[PDB]
């Protein structure tokens, strides 16, 4: 099936996670007059917001990945939910709300876990 842009918004986190490229395509293209400056401001805004998400993927060792596995172990303080009660029960919309507070913390952990990982790889290849 082909649900469309945000088609799986109401589907479960597991279902939507197979339709990632759907939302990844339309993030950069889409699904001195008044309109002239109004459009230019939007064309620059789209690029800035895109490169910010790409910037975070880059410093997490996830550049080029849609599904990216990391080294940060899941702190149960963030959410003490079982695996089967998340990917087959919740929607990404609900999940983003429940992890609203802890999102900024995870973003830092994913960063130093990458600068230490490549610092280690620089030593693994020092022989």
């Amino acid at each position: 099936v082909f649900l469309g842009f945000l088609g799986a918004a109401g589907s479960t986190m597991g279902a939507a996670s197979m339709t990632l490229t759907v939302q990844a395509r339309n993030l950069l293209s889409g699904i001195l007059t008044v309109w002239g400056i109004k459009q230019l401001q939007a064309r620059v805004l789209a690029v800035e917001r895109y490169l910010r998400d790409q910037q975070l993927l880059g410093i997490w060792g996830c550049s080029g990945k849609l599904i990216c596995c990391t080294n940060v172990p899941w702190n149960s303080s963030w959410s003490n939910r079982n695996l089967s009660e998340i990917w087959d029960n919740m929607t990404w919309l609900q999940w983003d709300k429940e992890i609203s507070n802890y999102t900024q913390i995870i973003y830092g952990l994913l960063e130093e876990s990458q600068n230490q990982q490549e610092k280690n790889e620089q030593d693994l290849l020092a022989l």
Binding site: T12, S84, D88, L93
Partner: protein, 128 residues
């Protein structure tokens, strides 16, 4: 993570039919099946059937297929992820063998192998 209140103890006599309600809250009604299960005097517990408020689909045991009227309304949305629903249940050829406590149960998950499993239950209704 919500309540599933039911009707009162309506005691009739054999031959008639009884309609038991099940009004939901605190959760998206159309996202989970509504199971119907009874524990009568003479046997133990017996699973009657569930119905899918979203797809409208119904699956019930052959021991109750020609007796049970299983219908659902349509949820009245409260918030983005909350609604209020209602599930109905009737029985045709009622006797004294069918005397017991009846419950409705919300399904367990939205996918997987335990989708319809009676997880969140009501309170019970005493029949004839």
């Amino acid at each position: 993570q919500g309540q599933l209140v039911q009707s009162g103890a309506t005691t009739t006599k054999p031959g008639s039919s009884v309609k038991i309600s099940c009004k939901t809250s605190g959760y998206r009604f159309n996202f989970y099946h509504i199971n119907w299960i009874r524990q009568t005097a003479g046997r133990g517990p017996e699973w009657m059937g569930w119905i899918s408020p979203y797809s409208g689909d119904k699956n019930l045991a052959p021991a109750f297929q020609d007796r049970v009227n299983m219908t659902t309304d349509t949820e009245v949305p409260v918030t983005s992820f909350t609604s209020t629903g209602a599930a109905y249940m009737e029985i045709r050829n009622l006797t004294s063998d069918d005397t017991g406590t009846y419950f409705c149960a919300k399904g367990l998950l939205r996918d997987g192998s335990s989708t319809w499993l009676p997880y969140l239950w009501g309170q019970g209704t005493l029949l004839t």
